[PDB]
Write a protein that binds this ligand. Structure first.
Ligand SMILES: NC(=O)c1ccc[n+]([C@@H]2O[C@H](COP(=O)([O-])OP(=O)(O)OC[C@H]3O[C@@H](n4cnc5c(N)ncnc54)[C@H](OP(=O)(O)O)[C@@H]3O)[C@@H](O)[C@H]2O)c1
Ligand SMILES: NC(=O)c1ccc[n+]([C@@H]2O[C@H](COP(=O)([O-])OP(=O)(O)OC[C@H]3O[C@@H](n4cnc5c(N)ncnc54)[C@H](OP(=O)(O)O)[C@@H]3O)[C@@H](O)[C@H]2O)c1
Ligand SMILES: [Cl-]
Ligand SMILES: [Cl-]
Lengths: 316, 316
């Protein structure tokens, strides 16, 4: 039976804990362990990777399937020697449900004027603010795949008006959607913009000043909000900053940044209407990752086709 | 046609805005207007009241129905001269949906360790924290009426494990519930305690140190959280403070207080794991209030029975 290489830059206690009883019957080679730093890795069919070392695929030339530890593959596609074999991304109910938690939290924080109420609290001042209900706000989600769909349905169920956008059009009860050419109509209706796009050459810098200026100003706060949990390379941070300073954006939630970890010198840390999280919108449940990997190995070895394979030309 | 007295201590622009076109065919006497401060109010059948003046029912001895501006009636029951006629409380989809927004926000803030991530941000420090999913947390809701039920269903749909408690037992898909005697078993399973009880003589001071000590310590954070949006008189704030200081409570969200507005000298304002909101968990949509009132007047006058009538002996 082939070994499984595990090269995951995740919280190490979580990886170690999940290894126990994982991949039964297979040797598991965890490259976090210094004992394994010189081991040759030829003749091994499977690797599970997240921020893996540059020389990995030169050490493991015989891989038959590469498994990403995350849903996003923009970094893995750039790794030297990435083999010409299927690359399977992480898709799982645990990941999806976690992202929807984060998206719901952001939409509620901005809806319920959390920062305004915290500023009042800091002054020890009791003051009720006029308050729209979720149905008074349209959330527009750019990115209508696994995560965008689950987030949209959950937002709608909480009472938000929800609309969606992606390259092609899709059918989702209670959610009107737009295809690529509908972008401007979608943006003009959107009060809270949620980014759940992969980073690809075609989504690079898509979230810029010109796009923020097209968002709706007709909503209950008079200015839109930007929430991104896709990839940082999709946004132009200089524009986000300028828009926040001018009031073109009323606030933002950012889980992802052009350069991560976010520099300690960034202005985003101290800004009163920005919520910064360190790329934790949906943590990979490592146990679930390994169950997904085990499952796909079983299909592969039985001749069934792999699921969630990446289109490497498209970048997702 | 009888006039309608409106004596509502709500945001005045909201009341004024909602008056337009309200109660068509009836004189509307808004007691916020100084012009009406000496008007006699006999021969008037209806009043809509929230924090109304003490002498109101002596000025209006002929009321046939009193309408509260809120869901809660503990204050109105204490008003001098409250007539011996039906008292109808506010119940409406707008109110319910708003409360569920607030409850969902609190459960997510505590689940997603928002204060920990804000403390990291204040130090300009990028650090991922181990993170449970909502299904790892049990939310126990004390109070299973209109609001408790809607909040429970919405929490469950977001992935939380949800359990409920109230005097009598109730049947709710996906939510196990407990009756009065099941209190201790319910508390022992609960990680996040949500209060959606009326204030009555029987719920006064129910949320105390003895009760907080019975909450589960087996959850992912090792200590429970207290969230109250019912009434402040149900909690003992001295105990909440002591429990937070000792770590018996890991955090709290409080929308209601023993004395409101909350004193500017309260410690709750500055406490890092408390979220204070100024009794805004669900604002009355005044427009919807008047539609509800108009509707009930129509039923009353057609001989149909009034809905949402309070049991004045029970206090709710
Ligand atoms: N912050 C975090 O912790 C975190 C966690 C997990 C994932 N993520 C990010 O979230 C992303 C989405 O994940 P997912 O599972 O939902 O992906 P998915 O199922 O592949 O969905 C991707 C969506 O983006 C659309 N899209 C791609 N390129 C586009 C373009 N140029 N114009 C318009 N639409 C475009 C796709 O449209 P089509 O269907 O028409 O192709 C599809 O609707 C991942 O790529 C990852 O970067 C972040
Ligand atoms: N913070 C805010 O902005 C805000 C806004 C709206 C409402 N509220 C508060 O929320 C409360 C609940 O509203 P609601 O519409 O959900 O009320 P509801 O429909 O009357 O529900 C009340 C629930 O509390 C239970 N209950 C009452 N006394 C009890 C006792 N001694 N022991 C156990 N259970 C008891 C009732 O049980 P039974 O069914 O068995 O009687 C019922 O399940 C209101 O009274 C108001 O004070 C606050
Ligand atoms: Cl800001
Ligand atoms: Cl605290």
């Amino acid at each position: 039976k082939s070994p499984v290489i595990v090269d995951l830059k995740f919280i190490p206690e979580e990886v170690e804990a999940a290894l126990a009883g994982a991949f039964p019957g297979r040797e598991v080679i965890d490259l976090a362990d210094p004992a394994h730093q010189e081991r040759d890795l030829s003749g091994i069919d499977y690797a599970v990777v997240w921020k893996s070392a540059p020389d990995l695929f030169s050490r493991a030339p015989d891989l038959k399937v590469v498994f990403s530890g995350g849903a996003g593959v923009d970094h893995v596609l750039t790794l030297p020697g990435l083999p010409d074999v299927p690359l399977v991304r992480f898709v799982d109910r645990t990941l999806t449900t976690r992202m929807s938690e984060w998206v719901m939290m952001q939409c509620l924080l901005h809806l319920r004027q959390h920062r305004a109420y915290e500023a009042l609290a800091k002054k020890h001042e009791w003051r009720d603010l006029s308050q729209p209900e979720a149905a008074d706000v349209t959330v527009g989600i750019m990115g209508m795949g696994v995560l965008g769909q689950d987030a949209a349905r959950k937002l709608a169920a909480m009472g938000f008006k929800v609309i969606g956008w992606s390259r092609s059009k899709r059918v989702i009860e209670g959610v009107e959607t737009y295809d690529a050419a509908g972008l401007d109509a979608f943006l003009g209706r959107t009060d809270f913009l949620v980014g759940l796009l992969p980073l690809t050459p075609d989504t690079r810098g898509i979230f810029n000043a010109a796009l923020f200026a097209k968002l709706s100003r007709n909503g209950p706060f008079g200015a839109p909000v930007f929430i991104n949990a896709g990839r940082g390379g999709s946004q132009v941070e200089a524009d986000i900053l300028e828009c926040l300073d001018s009031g073109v954006l009323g606030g933002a939630s950012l889980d992802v940044f052009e350069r991560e970890p976010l520099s300690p010198e960034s202005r985003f840390w101290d800004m009163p209407n920005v919520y910064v999280t360190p790329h934790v919108a949906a943590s990979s449940d490592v146990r679930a990752l390994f169950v997904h990997v085990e499952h796909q190995i079983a299909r592969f070895e039985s001749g069934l086709p792999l699921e969630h394979v990446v289109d490497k030309v498209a970048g997702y």
